[PDB]
Short mmCIF file of C-alpha atoms and ligand atoms in Angstrom, two decimals:
data_model
loop_
_atom_site.label_atom_id
_atom_site.label_comp_id
_atom_site.label_asym_id
_atom_site.label_seq_id
_atom_site.Cartn_x
_atom_site.Cartn_y
_atom_site.Cartn_z
CA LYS A 1 -0.38 28.52 -7.38
CA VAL A 2 1.44 26.70 -4.55
CA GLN A 3 0.13 24.22 -1.97
CA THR A 4 -1.96 25.43 1.02
CA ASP A 5 -1.18 24.46 4.66
CA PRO A 6 -3.88 21.88 5.00
CA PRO A 7 -3.51 20.73 1.36
CA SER A 8 -6.43 21.18 -1.02
CA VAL A 9 -4.79 22.17 -4.30
CA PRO A 10 -4.81 19.03 -6.42
CA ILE A 11 -1.44 17.98 -7.81
CA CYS A 12 -2.47 18.54 -11.44
CA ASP A 13 -3.25 22.20 -10.73
CA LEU A 14 0.24 22.60 -9.19
CA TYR A 15 2.05 21.47 -12.35
CA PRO A 16 -0.01 23.24 -15.09
CA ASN A 17 2.45 21.81 -17.60
CA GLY A 18 1.16 18.31 -16.98
CA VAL A 19 4.73 17.22 -16.32
CA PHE A 20 5.08 15.73 -12.85
CA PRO A 21 8.11 15.50 -10.50
CA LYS A 22 10.20 12.44 -11.12
CA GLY A 23 11.07 9.99 -8.36
CA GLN A 24 14.60 9.19 -7.32
CA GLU A 25 16.34 7.74 -10.36
CA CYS A 26 18.81 4.90 -9.73
CA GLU A 27 21.22 3.11 -12.06
CA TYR A 28 20.60 -0.61 -12.24
CA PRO A 29 22.95 -2.75 -10.13
CA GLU A 30 19.90 5.61 -27.12
CA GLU A 31 17.53 2.76 -27.95
CA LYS A 32 16.45 1.71 -24.48
CA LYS A 33 16.03 5.48 -24.24
CA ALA A 34 13.47 5.65 -27.00
CA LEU A 35 11.66 2.68 -25.49
CA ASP A 36 11.46 4.59 -22.23
CA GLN A 37 10.39 7.86 -23.86
CA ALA A 38 7.56 6.02 -25.61
CA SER A 39 5.83 5.11 -22.32
CA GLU A 40 6.32 8.60 -20.87
CA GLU A 41 2.61 9.41 -20.42
CA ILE A 42 2.51 6.26 -18.26
CA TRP A 43 5.56 7.10 -16.12
CA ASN A 44 4.11 10.57 -15.72
CA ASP A 45 0.79 9.13 -14.54
CA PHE A 46 2.66 7.22 -11.85
CA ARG A 47 4.48 10.42 -10.82
CA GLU A 48 1.31 12.44 -10.42
CA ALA A 49 -0.09 9.68 -8.21
CA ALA A 50 3.19 9.79 -6.24
CA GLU A 51 3.29 13.51 -5.63
CA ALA A 52 -0.22 13.16 -4.21
CA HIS A 53 0.97 10.37 -1.92
CA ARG A 54 3.99 12.37 -0.72
CA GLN A 55 1.88 15.44 0.17
CA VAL A 56 -0.90 13.40 1.76
CA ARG A 57 1.46 11.50 4.04
CA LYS A 58 3.47 14.62 5.02
CA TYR A 59 0.11 16.04 6.12
CA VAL A 60 -0.79 12.91 8.10
CA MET A 61 2.52 12.89 9.91
CA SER A 62 1.77 16.44 11.02
CA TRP A 63 -1.38 15.53 12.94
CA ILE A 64 -1.39 11.80 13.68
CA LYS A 65 -1.53 11.54 17.44
CA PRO A 66 -2.56 9.16 20.18
CA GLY A 67 -6.08 10.03 21.26
CA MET A 68 -7.57 10.05 17.76
CA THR A 69 -9.77 7.14 16.75
CA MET A 70 -8.61 4.95 13.89
CA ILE A 71 -11.72 5.88 11.94
CA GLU A 72 -10.88 9.55 12.38
CA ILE A 73 -7.32 9.07 11.16
CA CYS A 74 -8.43 7.21 8.01
CA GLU A 75 -11.25 9.57 7.05
CA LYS A 76 -8.97 12.57 7.52
CA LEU A 77 -6.18 11.01 5.43
CA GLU A 78 -8.58 9.83 2.70
CA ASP A 79 -10.38 13.19 2.43
CA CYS A 80 -7.09 14.94 1.71
CA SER A 81 -6.06 12.13 -0.63
CA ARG A 82 -9.29 12.48 -2.66
CA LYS A 83 -8.65 16.22 -2.99
CA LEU A 84 -4.97 16.23 -4.15
CA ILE A 85 -5.44 13.24 -6.50
CA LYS A 86 -8.49 15.10 -7.78
CA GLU A 87 -10.67 12.00 -7.64
CA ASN A 88 -12.60 11.34 -10.85
CA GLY A 89 -14.33 7.97 -10.80
CA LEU A 90 -11.83 5.45 -12.11
CA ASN A 91 -9.63 7.96 -13.91
CA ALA A 92 -8.21 9.38 -10.69
CA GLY A 93 -8.66 8.28 -7.09
CA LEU A 94 -7.70 6.08 -4.15
CA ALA A 95 -6.07 2.80 -5.19
CA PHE A 96 -7.07 1.16 -1.92
CA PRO A 97 -8.36 1.73 1.66
CA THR A 98 -6.07 3.23 4.31
CA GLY A 99 -4.39 0.41 6.16
CA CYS A 100 -3.61 1.35 9.76
CA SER A 101 -2.75 -2.09 11.20
CA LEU A 102 -1.85 -2.03 14.87
CA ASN A 103 0.93 -3.70 16.85
CA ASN A 104 1.00 -7.45 16.13
CA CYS A 105 -1.27 -6.79 13.16
CA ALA A 106 1.01 -6.19 10.20
CA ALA A 107 -1.37 -5.36 7.33
CA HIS A 108 -4.83 -5.02 5.90
CA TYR A 109 -6.55 -3.54 8.89
CA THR A 110 -8.80 -0.53 8.33
CA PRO A 111 -11.77 0.27 10.60
CA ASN A 112 -15.35 -0.75 9.73
CA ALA A 113 -18.37 1.20 11.05
CA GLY A 114 -18.59 1.33 14.80
CA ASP A 115 -14.93 0.59 15.48
CA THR A 116 -14.07 2.56 18.67
CA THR A 117 -10.37 1.71 18.65
CA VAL A 118 -8.21 4.67 19.65
CA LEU A 119 -4.57 5.14 18.68
CA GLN A 120 -2.38 4.79 21.75
CA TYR A 121 1.01 6.19 22.75
CA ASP A 122 2.66 2.75 22.68
CA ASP A 123 1.09 1.60 19.38
CA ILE A 124 3.12 0.84 16.29
CA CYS A 125 0.78 1.79 13.44
CA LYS A 126 1.50 0.93 9.81
CA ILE A 127 -0.08 3.50 7.47
CA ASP A 128 -0.47 2.00 3.97
CA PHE A 129 -2.52 3.85 1.39
CA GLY A 130 -2.49 4.16 -2.37
CA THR A 131 -3.33 6.74 -5.02
CA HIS A 132 -3.73 6.12 -8.75
CA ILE A 133 -4.14 8.03 -12.00
CA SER A 134 -5.69 5.95 -14.76
CA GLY A 135 -5.00 2.76 -12.89
CA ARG A 136 -1.28 3.49 -12.50
CA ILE A 137 -1.17 2.57 -8.79
CA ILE A 138 1.20 3.96 -6.13
CA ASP A 139 1.49 1.47 -3.18
CA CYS A 140 3.62 3.16 -0.52
CA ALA A 141 3.58 2.84 3.27
CA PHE A 142 5.41 3.80 6.43
CA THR A 143 5.24 3.07 10.14
CA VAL A 144 4.13 5.48 12.87
CA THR A 145 5.28 5.39 16.51
CA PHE A 146 5.42 7.81 19.44
CA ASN A 147 7.45 5.77 21.91
CA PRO A 148 11.13 5.70 20.79
CA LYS A 149 11.52 2.16 22.14
CA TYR A 150 10.57 1.03 18.61
CA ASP A 151 13.16 3.26 16.95
CA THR A 152 15.59 0.43 16.24
CA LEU A 153 12.82 -1.85 15.00
CA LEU A 154 11.74 0.83 12.52
CA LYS A 155 15.28 1.46 11.37
CA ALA A 156 15.71 -2.25 10.78
CA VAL A 157 12.70 -2.55 8.52
CA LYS A 158 13.41 0.73 6.74
CA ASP A 159 16.97 -0.41 6.11
CA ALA A 160 15.70 -3.78 4.87
CA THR A 161 13.23 -2.13 2.51
CA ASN A 162 15.79 0.22 0.93
CA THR A 163 18.10 -2.78 0.65
CA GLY A 164 15.43 -4.54 -1.35
CA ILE A 165 14.92 -1.40 -3.39
CA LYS A 166 18.63 -1.18 -4.19
CA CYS A 167 19.02 -4.85 -5.16
CA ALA A 168 16.01 -4.69 -7.48
CA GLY A 169 16.56 -4.35 -11.22
CA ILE A 170 16.07 -5.94 -14.62
CA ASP A 171 17.23 -9.58 -14.74
CA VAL A 172 17.64 -9.60 -10.96
CA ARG A 173 16.54 -12.98 -9.57
CA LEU A 174 13.59 -12.45 -7.18
CA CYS A 175 14.97 -14.87 -4.57
CA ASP A 176 18.20 -12.83 -4.30
CA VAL A 177 16.28 -9.70 -3.28
CA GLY A 178 14.52 -11.77 -0.65
CA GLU A 179 17.81 -13.17 0.59
CA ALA A 180 19.33 -9.71 0.63
CA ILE A 181 16.37 -8.21 2.49
CA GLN A 182 16.57 -10.87 5.20
CA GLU A 183 20.32 -10.63 5.74
CA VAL A 184 20.02 -6.91 6.50
CA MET A 185 16.83 -7.32 8.54
CA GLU A 186 18.26 -9.98 10.83
CA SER A 187 21.50 -8.01 11.33
CA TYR A 188 19.47 -5.80 13.70
CA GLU A 189 18.82 -6.71 17.32
CA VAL A 190 16.38 -4.64 19.40
CA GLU A 191 15.31 -4.20 22.99
CA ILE A 192 11.75 -3.29 23.87
CA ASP A 193 10.55 -3.18 27.48
CA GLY A 194 13.52 -5.09 28.93
CA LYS A 195 13.54 -7.89 26.34
CA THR A 196 15.82 -8.20 23.31
CA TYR A 197 14.94 -9.61 19.86
CA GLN A 198 16.68 -10.18 16.54
CA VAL A 199 14.27 -8.66 14.02
CA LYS A 200 12.85 -11.33 11.74
CA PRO A 201 11.11 -10.78 8.38
CA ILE A 202 7.48 -11.87 8.27
CA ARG A 203 8.18 -14.77 5.92
CA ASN A 204 4.63 -15.21 4.59
CA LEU A 205 4.42 -11.51 3.66
CA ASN A 206 5.96 -9.93 0.60
CA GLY A 207 6.30 -7.29 -2.09
CA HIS A 208 4.52 -7.69 -5.43
CA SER A 209 4.37 -6.67 -9.08
CA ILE A 210 1.82 -4.04 -10.08
CA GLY A 211 -0.42 -3.96 -13.14
CA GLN A 212 -2.96 -1.36 -14.31
CA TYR A 213 -5.89 -1.27 -11.90
CA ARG A 214 -4.27 -4.34 -10.37
CA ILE A 215 -2.45 -3.91 -7.07
CA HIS A 216 -1.06 -7.47 -7.03
CA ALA A 217 -0.40 -8.35 -10.67
CA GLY A 218 1.15 -11.80 -10.16
CA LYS A 219 4.80 -12.03 -9.08
CA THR A 220 5.97 -11.90 -5.47
CA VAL A 221 9.08 -10.33 -3.95
CA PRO A 222 10.05 -12.46 -0.94
CA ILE A 223 11.59 -10.95 2.18
CA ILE A 224 13.36 -14.18 3.09
CA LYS A 225 15.69 -16.64 1.37
CA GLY A 226 14.38 -19.70 -0.44
CA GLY A 227 12.37 -17.71 -2.94
CA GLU A 228 11.98 -18.19 -6.71
CA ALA A 229 14.75 -17.44 -9.23
CA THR A 230 12.23 -15.72 -11.50
CA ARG A 231 13.68 -12.44 -12.72
CA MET A 232 12.29 -8.93 -12.78
CA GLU A 233 11.77 -7.77 -16.35
CA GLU A 234 12.08 -4.49 -18.22
CA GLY A 235 9.06 -2.24 -17.86
CA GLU A 236 7.61 -3.92 -14.78
CA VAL A 237 6.30 -2.08 -11.74
CA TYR A 238 6.87 -3.47 -8.27
CA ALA A 239 5.80 -2.80 -4.72
CA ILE A 240 8.93 -3.24 -2.63
CA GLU A 241 7.70 -3.86 0.92
CA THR A 242 9.30 -5.57 3.91
CA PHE A 243 7.93 -6.38 7.35
CA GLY A 244 9.94 -6.75 10.54
CA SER A 245 8.61 -8.54 13.62
CA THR A 246 9.42 -9.45 17.23
CA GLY A 247 6.99 -12.35 17.08
CA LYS A 248 7.06 -15.57 15.07
CA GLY A 249 7.63 -13.94 11.70
CA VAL A 250 4.40 -15.21 10.18
CA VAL A 251 0.99 -13.62 9.92
CA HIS A 252 -2.41 -15.31 10.08
CA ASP A 253 -6.03 -14.29 9.46
CA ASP A 254 -7.31 -12.42 12.49
CA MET A 255 -10.11 -10.01 13.47
CA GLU A 256 -13.09 -8.86 11.44
CA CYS A 257 -12.56 -8.30 7.71
CA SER A 258 -12.62 -4.80 6.23
CA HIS A 259 -10.83 -4.96 2.87
CA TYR A 260 -12.42 -6.52 -0.21
CA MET A 261 -11.46 -6.73 -3.88
CA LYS A 262 -13.02 -8.08 -7.03
CA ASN A 263 -11.10 -11.05 -8.42
CA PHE A 264 -9.25 -9.50 -11.38
CA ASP A 265 -9.56 -12.59 -13.62
CA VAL A 266 -13.30 -13.18 -13.29
CA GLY A 267 -15.58 -12.01 -16.08
CA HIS A 268 -19.23 -10.88 -16.27
CA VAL A 269 -21.48 -12.99 -14.06
CA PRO A 270 -25.28 -12.70 -14.42
CA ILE A 271 -26.86 -12.12 -11.00
CA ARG A 272 -30.63 -12.18 -10.60
CA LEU A 273 -30.63 -11.82 -6.79
CA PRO A 274 -31.72 -8.15 -6.21
CA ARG A 275 -29.31 -6.99 -3.49
CA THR A 276 -26.33 -9.01 -4.67
CA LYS A 277 -26.81 -7.73 -8.22
CA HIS A 278 -26.96 -4.15 -6.93
CA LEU A 279 -23.88 -4.50 -4.77
CA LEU A 280 -21.86 -5.92 -7.65
CA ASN A 281 -22.98 -3.06 -9.88
CA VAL A 282 -21.84 -0.62 -7.22
CA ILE A 283 -18.47 -2.31 -6.95
CA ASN A 284 -17.99 -2.31 -10.75
CA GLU A 285 -18.93 1.38 -11.12
CA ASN A 286 -16.97 2.60 -8.13
CA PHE A 287 -13.98 0.31 -7.68
CA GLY A 288 -13.68 -1.92 -10.72
CA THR A 289 -10.77 -4.19 -9.80
CA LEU A 290 -9.40 -1.78 -7.20
CA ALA A 291 -9.68 -2.83 -3.55
CA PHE A 292 -12.25 -1.17 -1.25
CA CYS A 293 -13.54 -1.44 2.33
CA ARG A 294 -16.94 -1.48 4.08
CA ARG A 295 -16.58 2.19 5.02
CA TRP A 296 -16.36 3.06 1.34
CA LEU A 297 -19.68 1.29 0.82
CA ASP A 298 -21.47 3.04 3.69
CA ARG A 299 -20.01 6.23 2.28
CA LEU A 300 -21.97 5.63 -0.93
CA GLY A 301 -25.24 5.34 0.95
CA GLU A 302 -25.24 1.55 0.81
CA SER A 303 -26.71 -0.30 3.82
CA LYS A 304 -27.83 -3.88 4.41
CA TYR A 305 -25.08 -5.15 2.14
CA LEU A 306 -23.16 -7.60 4.31
CA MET A 307 -25.06 -10.65 3.03
CA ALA A 308 -24.73 -9.53 -0.62
CA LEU A 309 -21.02 -8.95 -0.10
CA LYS A 310 -20.75 -12.45 1.35
CA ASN A 311 -22.64 -13.90 -1.63
CA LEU A 312 -20.17 -12.24 -3.98
CA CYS A 313 -17.33 -13.61 -1.88
CA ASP A 314 -18.77 -17.15 -2.01
CA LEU A 315 -19.25 -16.78 -5.77
CA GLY A 316 -15.55 -16.02 -6.15
CA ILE A 317 -16.47 -12.70 -7.73
CA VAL A 318 -15.05 -10.82 -4.80
CA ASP A 319 -12.21 -11.96 -2.51
CA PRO A 320 -11.92 -10.79 1.10
CA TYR A 321 -8.57 -9.65 2.52
CA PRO A 322 -8.68 -9.97 6.34
CA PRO A 323 -6.09 -8.37 8.66
CA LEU A 324 -2.78 -10.25 8.87
CA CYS A 325 -1.37 -10.40 12.41
CA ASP A 326 1.60 -12.09 14.11
CA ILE A 327 1.23 -13.57 17.58
CA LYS A 328 -0.39 -11.55 20.38
CA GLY A 329 2.16 -9.34 22.10
CA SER A 330 4.56 -9.08 19.16
CA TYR A 331 5.39 -5.86 17.35
CA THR A 332 5.45 -5.43 13.58
CA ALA A 333 6.76 -2.63 11.33
CA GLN A 334 6.57 -1.92 7.56
CA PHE A 335 8.02 0.32 4.83
CA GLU A 336 6.92 0.23 1.20
CA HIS A 337 7.77 1.96 -2.08
CA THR A 338 6.67 1.53 -5.70
CA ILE A 339 9.48 1.24 -8.28
CA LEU A 340 9.44 1.61 -12.06
CA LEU A 341 11.68 -0.76 -14.01
CA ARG A 342 12.23 1.68 -16.87
CA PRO A 343 14.60 0.86 -19.81
CA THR A 344 16.94 3.71 -18.87
CA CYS A 345 16.97 3.17 -15.10
CA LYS A 346 15.24 2.09 -11.88
CA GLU A 347 13.00 4.80 -10.38
CA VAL A 348 11.78 4.86 -6.76
CA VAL A 349 8.84 7.00 -7.87
CA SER A 350 7.28 7.24 -4.40
CA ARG A 351 10.51 8.30 -2.68
CA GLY A 352 10.26 11.42 -0.59
CA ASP A 353 12.58 13.49 1.56
CA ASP A 354 10.88 11.63 4.43
CA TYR A 355 11.66 8.01 3.52
C1 I96 B 1 -0.80 -9.07 2.40
C2 I96 B 1 -0.23 -9.41 1.03
C3 I96 B 1 1.20 -8.87 0.91
C4 I96 B 1 -1.17 -9.01 -0.14
C5 I96 B 1 -2.08 -10.03 -0.64
C6 I96 B 1 -2.98 -9.74 -1.72
C7 I96 B 1 -3.00 -8.48 -2.31
C8 I96 B 1 -2.13 -7.47 -1.85
C9 I96 B 1 -1.20 -7.69 -0.76
N1 I96 B 1 -0.37 -6.65 -0.37
C10 I96 B 1 -0.69 -5.42 0.04
N2 I96 B 1 -1.83 -4.79 0.25
C11 I96 B 1 -1.45 -3.56 0.67
S1 I96 B 1 -2.48 -2.23 1.14
C12 I96 B 1 -4.29 -2.60 0.99
C13 I96 B 1 -4.85 -3.92 0.49
C14 I96 B 1 -5.67 -4.79 1.20
C15 I96 B 1 -6.05 -5.92 0.43
C16 I96 B 1 -5.56 -5.90 -0.84
S2 I96 B 1 -4.62 -4.51 -1.11
N3 I96 B 1 -0.13 -3.37 0.75
N4 I96 B 1 0.34 -4.56 0.35
CO1 CO B 2 0.87 -1.30 0.46
CO1 CO B 3 1.98 -3.62 -1.28
#
């Protein structure tokens, strides 16, 4: 069948063949054809996760409006996301919590229980959510606004992101992408509420390589010059994301924490403490090394877990990821896409007709 208005038909039931739509294929800036064909089931897994992301976001953009609480926006997005991705434990599901960072806050903000924050008409909200199939994660995000005064800011970041996406490729030095991204970003000048600004990349923020069940696999893609000359290799997966800002161009820890994630390199740790032991078991069964948030714990009937979560954090078993905000009064925007460095070409797998 086809997709229903409010989606509900999982993406695997819409492509009975098992073959999923391919992302935009780009030529980098026979044999390495067989090498690509060999990892097809993997590429395909990424694609299924991407089609889910495209349909979920198109839905969100249809109803996101000032007046709705942040909690309402995230639960509504996630419920659709679970459906289309056809959540199945760790085989299929949500790669990470729905980021909806507001204004000066650039990333990693998702509401915890009791948050009464309401989306406003002048807010610049960054929606960042991920879907995965067998750990093949799709990290893709866009910015939402209602007041056109941000229009040029959004175009700057979007243009910077696609610039980074175009400069990416096998053997491409990582610091050149960063340099490229910045040059485009700072070529934009905007005016918001009577004041003008030259958009500046958030220097301490950046794209990253992606591994199975591992959102941030190790390498970083700067969005400013002065980065590392390390090159992108064949077969790597990257999250190309840029952040524009009218503030200082640097984020810092701010607000209450909501995102958490088990340290990928830590092994089995014996825990005798009742509640801490239980919490860890819950994290291992439900999220493994995938990031989660407090709402996803309440959702599982867990309560009285804050201290256990803290214990796990102090044990280095779980790392917290607090919201990252620029200075009060500044505005930040973001655009992100996941790319596949295949042997035959560069594929912006999460590309849509929207962005
Ligand atoms: C902030 C910085 C670039 C960062 C540090 C460590 C892990 C992941 C990310 N990136 C990222 N996260 C996301 S969405 C949700 C997540 C929250 C915490 C980890 S993943 N998009 N990009
Ligand atoms: Co992201
Ligand atoms: Co990312």
